[PDB]
Design a protein around this nucleic acid. Structure first.
Ligand SMILES: [Mg+2]
Ligand SMILES: [Mg+2]
Ligand SMILES: [Mg+2]
Ligand SMILES: [Mg+2]
Ligand SMILES: [Mg+2]
Ligand SMILES: [Mg+2]
Ligand SMILES: [Mg+2]
Lengths: 41, 94, 97, 140, 107, 55, 67, 155, 166
RNA sequence: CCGAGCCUGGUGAUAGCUGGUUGUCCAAGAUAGAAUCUUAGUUCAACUUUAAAUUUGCCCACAGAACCAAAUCCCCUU
């Protein structure tokens, strides 16, 4: 497919260029900093 | 020697203030502006019966546009181009 | 002054050890071996932590139930105290009820 | 004791380099320094407004000085220049008062003449000719 | 802060632009790495944009050194003995072009 | 489970569902997972439509 | 100039005077600090800006006989 | 302090070409190189060999032309100034301080082949006027007079 | 701890060209771990700062402080090493360039107070540093004259500029 | 430091109470009430926040709201 042709063009897939699907990993909220510290919600 | 009991500008005993000439003039200026406002609102163009429905089409259409946006809210598309573009982070010369 | 005045000794890592070169091997033994084995039994570790995740309270309860008999006396007492404390904390304290 | 902070020094120095020119223990003690570097920056932010205001006041004072040197008063000078339709701002008015005294005397003469023309029109109260320098150039 | 920093007066290098304008940028040195992921934008800038910049600025000597490095950098030497190493580490090609043009327009 | 020009599929779905709605149906096209989402319940009509197209 | 000066109302005619200038530098200002602080409310913000700047050299002022 | 030649990133021919192009002058390359070569460098390298053309002709031509051209400019701008005042102005403009300042900010020191660093002010002045001479031989009296105007009346 | 003075004594200079000033000799000396307070030793050193060697020796010999006696010993042995090892010509041709006292390594001892209270005593130790320079003592800086004051005031008045304008 | 010794353990006792709660930046964001051994708290409601779905939301024209003052409710236009 066109996607596989793009793969042939693109650099090699290794363990160094792997990314999660965007939206799957909601960031952790931890109580540090001005906004989330102090009374920590 | 002369002290106002408690706080100056609150309570039963307050420090008296007096009206200055420029304050009086400021109020008079604003009074003139709003008297002119009275006049220009005192001459109306149409009457209520003559204006009863002259904007219904435009108002309705504007609300329909609002509804169309609020209903067209939806998630965006996703692309092979972006997902495979992330592979360039190891694009080396040689 | 909490900072080293000299560079630390170089940390050379051999990316091609036996262990690194064969990491991940046989992790598909179930779906490539007629489901005779499982990665859960490929796991090696404490007998009470093979193929089971749990939180801290669950881990403590599981360890006490499985290896509590053949456990040192002071460690068992500490585990009992830990379980009691965790029970109180998880069941009576927090922000969401 | 895994995951300790190792660049606390560089953070302390980030604050201290701005604390360096102060007087007392607040030039080297991080707690005392940071409670004053914050107060310094907050003034560096309000001092912008204050600088603008003070510069305008300085211009007004210098313009008043020169105007009184020519026997005129500052309100008269400013108002009559506006009426004459010269839109030089107070900065360049002060610059001319200091560096271009003859040009400033010319400006003061023009403003005085406009004031006299205004007095003449007010006293006449009729439909006399408007006045040579009281004429308004119109734009469309 | 002003009180805690130096200050100077508005000036030119050698009454620049009285008779003619002389570009004050003299040398640009580009330290770039062949294999560093931090040097991707720099590599692409050397690929596509450096030649046209060199043609547009015949009075600037651009040295490009490809060597193993973790932070690609730029050293800006001006006619009056100035020097400006700026990090182009993890910058896009458009950002690097913008920075290089700003260096060219600097005194 | 869509292979090929999912944008062509989007165009076909839009111009087939438009008469049934009046407005153009709101859709999301995902090419990674070759899938197409439409705001609203159109399962029966889309199943019949795909049957009649041959899939 | 010395002994005479011309005043626009408010602008002088372009046939009368030309100012010729030359763009000689395009630079950035030194970093400016915007810090906001409110006490007892944990209010503190810091921002650093660099306004763009242009250095222009005034080359010539020329007048022409047109009065 | 060490000379830019010994500092790492350096290419003499590229530097020469960039010097000419940033000055917007069509120099002749050999003339410019001989206008940067001084006699002290020749003697020092001869000693180093023990362990070609100098500046003199180009420097003298540039110096004489600078005297003549600055004199003409000055006495045409200020016809009521006497010979003493004109000569003193010309000597100030072709003086050591002004010439070395201009040469340093025009990156003549970086390209100067000499024996000592920093380049002695006399050596710098000689090399600057040798550059003037090379420009005179290359472009002509009108263009080099424009150069002289541009870089000394501005001083 | 750090002991850099004793190597400042060991810095060596390249040979001297026959047409430059003679480069007066410098000698560093110090006594470490002196049972005495650094503040008081500072008083003694500030007393003998900038004197001639013999003048300092006399003042110390007739001062009433244990620190004075110790500093006198250090000065005497410094003069000895000066004209024994650093090629100083005349043992009186030396003056005190630097004279400072530094804190030493102390000890903590309890001080029994009343009730059940206690205090921590410090067995104070100090160091003494001295630098001797060959040559007569430099002349003391003369007090400012009214001519100098008026000159400086005039320099300020003539250095005024018109502020915040063109 | 005996209105009930001291030490170890249960024990990380409990505390609607005080104190504390550690990077950067942006945004929305201010308080009708009811119960409660409750009024130093909490639950519901009110207000606030986010994400989704849909269509009306505020201002209001006239007419219309009881016998024994300022105003309000309702409300099409706009
Ligand atoms: Mg805090
Ligand atoms: Mg009071
Ligand atoms: Mg104002
Ligand atoms: Mg507690
Ligand atoms: Mg806000
Ligand atoms: Mg109750
Ligand atoms: Mg309570």
């Amino acid at each position: 497919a066109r996607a596989l042709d793009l793969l042939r063009g693109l650099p090699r897939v290794s363990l160094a260029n792997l990314k999660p699907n965007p939206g799957s990993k909601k960031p952790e909220r931890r109580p540090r900093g001005r906004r989330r510290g102090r009374k920590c919600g | 020697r002369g002290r106002i009991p408690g706080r100056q500008w609150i309570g039963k005993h307050r420090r008296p203030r007096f009206v200055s000439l420029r304050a009086k003039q400021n109020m008079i200026r604003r009074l003139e502006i709003e008297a002119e406002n009275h006049y220009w609102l005192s001459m109306p163009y149409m009457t209520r019966e003559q204006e009863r429905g002259h904007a219904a089409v435009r108002r309705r259409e504007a609300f329909e546009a609002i509804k169309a946006a609020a209903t067209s809210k939806f998630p965006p598309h996703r692309f092979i181009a972006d997902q495979l573009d992330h592979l360039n982070v190891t694009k080396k010369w040689s | 002054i909490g900072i080293r005045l000299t560079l630390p000794p170089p940390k050379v890592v051999d990316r091609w050890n036996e262990k690194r070169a064969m990491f991940g091997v046989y992790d598909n033994i179930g779906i490539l071996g007629n489901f005779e084995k499982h990665p859960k039994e490929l796991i090696r570790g404490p007998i009470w932590l093979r193929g089971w995740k749990g939180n801290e309270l669950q881990r403590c309860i599981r360890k006490r139930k499985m290896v509590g008999s053949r456990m040192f006396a002071d460690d068992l007492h500490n585990l009992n105290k830990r379980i009691r404390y965790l029970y109180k904390h998880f069941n009576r304290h927090g922000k969401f009820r | 004791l895994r995951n300790r902070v190792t660049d606390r020094y560089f953070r302390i120095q980030e604050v201290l380099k701005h604390a360096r020119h102060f007087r007392g223990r607040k030039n080297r003690c991080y707690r005392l320094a940071v409670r004053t570097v914050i107060r310094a920056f907050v003034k560096c932010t309000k001092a912008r407004y204050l600088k603008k205001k003070n510069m305008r006041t300085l211009w007004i004072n210098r313009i008043t000085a020169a105007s009184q040197e020519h026997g005129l008063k500052y309100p008269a000078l400013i108002g009559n220049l506006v009426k004459c339709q010269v839109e030089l701002n107070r900065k360049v008015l002060a610059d001319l008062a200091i560096y271009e005294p003859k040009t400033f005397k010319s400006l003061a003469a023009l403003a005085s003449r406009r004031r006299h023309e205004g007095f003449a029109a007010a006293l006449g109260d009729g439909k006399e000719p408007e006045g040579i320098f009281s004429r308004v150039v119109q734009y469309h | 802060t002003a009180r805690g920093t130096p200050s100077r007066f508005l000036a030119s290098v050698l009454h620049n632009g009285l008779g003619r304008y002389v570009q004050q940028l003299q040398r640009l040195s580009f330290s770039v790495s062949r294999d560093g992921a931090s040097s991707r934008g720099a590599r692409e800038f050397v690929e596509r944009e450096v030649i046209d910049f060199a043609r547009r600025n015949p009075g600037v000597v651009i040295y490009v050194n490809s060597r193993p490095c973790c932070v690609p950098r730029v050293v800006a030497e001006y006619l009056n003995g100035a020097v400006r190493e700026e990090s182009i580490h993890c910058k896009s090609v458009e950002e690097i072009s913008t920075l290089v043009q700003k260096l060219a327009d600097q005194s | 489970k869509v292979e090929g020009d999912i944008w062509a599929l989007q165009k076909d779905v839009e111009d087939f569902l438009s008469p049934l709605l009046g407005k153009t149906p709101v859709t999301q096209v995902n090419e990674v997972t070759g899938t197409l989402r439409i705001k609203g319940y159109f399962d029966q009509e889309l199943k019949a439509w795909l049957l009649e197209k041959g899939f | 100039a010395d002994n005479f000066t011309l005043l626009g109302k408010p602008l002088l005619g372009k046939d009368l005077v030309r100012v010729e200038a030359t763009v000689i530098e395009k630079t950035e200002s030194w970093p400016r600090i915007i810090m906001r602080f409110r006490k007892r409310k944990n209010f503190k913000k810091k921002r650093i800006v660099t306004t763009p700047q242009t250095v222009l050299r005034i080359n010539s002022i020329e007048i022409a006989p047109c009065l | 302090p060490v000379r830019r030649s010994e500092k790492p990133n350096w290419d003499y021919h590229a530097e020469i070409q960039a010097f000419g192009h940033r000055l917007q002058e069509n120099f002749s390359l050999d003339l410019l190189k001989t206008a940067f070569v001084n006699s002290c460098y020749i003697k020092s390298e001869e000693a180093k060999r023990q362990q070609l053309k100098s500046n003199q002709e180009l420097s003298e031509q540039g110096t004489s032309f600078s005297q003549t051209c600055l004199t003409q400019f000055l006495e045409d701008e200020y016809p009521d100034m006497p010979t003493e005042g004109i000569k003193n102005l010309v000597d100030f403009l072709t003086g050591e301080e002004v010439v070395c300042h201009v040469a340093r900010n025009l990156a003549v020191e970086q390209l100067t082949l000499s024996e000592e660093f920093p380049v002695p002010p006399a050596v710098l002045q000689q090399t600057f006027f040798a550059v003037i001479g090379a420009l005179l031989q290359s472009s002509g009296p009108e263009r080099t007079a424009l150069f002289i105007r541009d870089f000394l009346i501005t001083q | 701890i750090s002991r850099k003075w004793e190597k400042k004594n060991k810095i060596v200079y390249p040979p001297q060209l026959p047409g430059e000033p003679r480069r007066p000799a410098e000698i560093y000396h110090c006594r470490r771990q002196i049972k005495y307070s650094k503040d008081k030793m500072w008083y003694l050193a500030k007393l003998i700062r900038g004197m001639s060697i013999d003048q300092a020796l006399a003042q110390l010999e007739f001062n009433d402080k244990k620190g004075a006696k110790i500093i006198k010993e250090v000065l005497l042995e410094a003069q000895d090493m000066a004209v024994r090892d650093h090629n100083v010509e005349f043992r009186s041709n030396l003056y005190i360039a630097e004279s400072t006292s530094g804190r030493g390594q102390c000890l903590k001892r309890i001080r029994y107070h009343g009730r059940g209270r206690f205090g921590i005593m410090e067995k104070v130790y100090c160091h003494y540093f001295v630098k001797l320079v060959e040559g007569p003592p430099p002349p003391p800086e003369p007090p400012k004259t009214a001519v100098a004051h008026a000159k400086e005031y005039i320099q300020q008045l003539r250095s005024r500029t018109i502020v915040h304008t063109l």
